[PDB]
Amino acid sequence: GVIKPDMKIKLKMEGNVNGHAFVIEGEGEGKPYDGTNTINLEVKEGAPLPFSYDILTNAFNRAFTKYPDDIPNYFKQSFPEGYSWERTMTFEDKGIVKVKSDISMEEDSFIYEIHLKGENFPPNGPVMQKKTLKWEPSTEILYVRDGVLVGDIKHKLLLEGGGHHRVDFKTIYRAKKAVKLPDYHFVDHRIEILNHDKDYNKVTVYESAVARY
């Protein structure tokens, strides 16, 4: 098929959080039909990052989602043309991140061009203090809104010490062609930073995603 069972991943993120600019490049691979993906990432500019790396991970492609045949696959159907997405992550304490990503395909690889802007994070909040542990497993609710697909997530960051910090996600996914639109459904996610060096200049991220009724 146009989307192979094993696809490479190449991306670039230009970001700025609390005024701090930085660039991260990534190369990885995933199994689109199994809903898994792994990406090795390096900070090319702006190191060492002065904020929690977890706020970036979800930015590092729903084509990597396991779907049942009975739920139209908004993402996979969009190819080879591709799709783009825009997201707003609203944090418990006023911090906010806005991200946009363009996903295209080149042979057996997906290429992403990402732009991220984070602002208003409290100086003595877990993001700036780098006190986050990981994202808890999540469930994204997907449904059609104005001809495109919307995903909502009532998310939570697990903090060092055991506490949690809420983060509300709203993502709008836009296919670059007409595709069969799905009825509301859910996607269970589990994202993890598999390994990282001291200041997260070198990180490997992994995510699993499964669609369900």
Curated annotation (Swiss-Prot):
User: Any S-S bridges, and between which cysteines?
Assistant: none
Q: How does the record describe the protein's post-translational processing?
A: Contains a chromophore consisting of modified amino acid residues. The chromophore is formed by autocatalytic backbone condensation between Xaa-N and Gly-(N+2), oxidation of Tyr-(N+1) to didehydrotyrosine, and formation of a double bond to the alpha-amino nitrogen of residue Xaa-N. Maturation of the chromophore requires nothing other than molecular oxygen. The precise stereochemistry of the tyrosine has not been determined.
**Where is coiled-coil annotated?**
none
Query: What UniProt keywords apply to this chain's record, in alphabetical order?
Result: Chromophore, Luminescence, Photoprotein
Q: How is it used?
A: Fluorescent proteins have become a useful and ubiquitous tool for making chimeric proteins, where they function as a fluorescent protein tag. Typically they tolerate N- and C-terminal fusion to a broad variety of proteins. They have been expressed in most known cell types and are used as a noninvasive fluorescent marker in living cells and organisms. They enable a wide range of applications where they have functioned as a cell lineage tracer, reporter of gene expression, or as a measure of protein-protein interactions.
Which BP terms from GO are recorded? bioluminescence; generation of precursor metabolites and energy
Found, by tissue, as follows:
Tentacle and oral disk.
Q: What does this protein do?
A: Pigment protein that is green in color.
Which family, according to UniProt? Belongs to the GFP family.
**Official protein name in the record:** GFP-like fluorescent chromoprotein cFP484
Q: Which organism is it from?
A: Clavularia sp. (Brown star polyp)
Query: Fragment boundaries within the full protein?
Result: 44 to 259 of 266
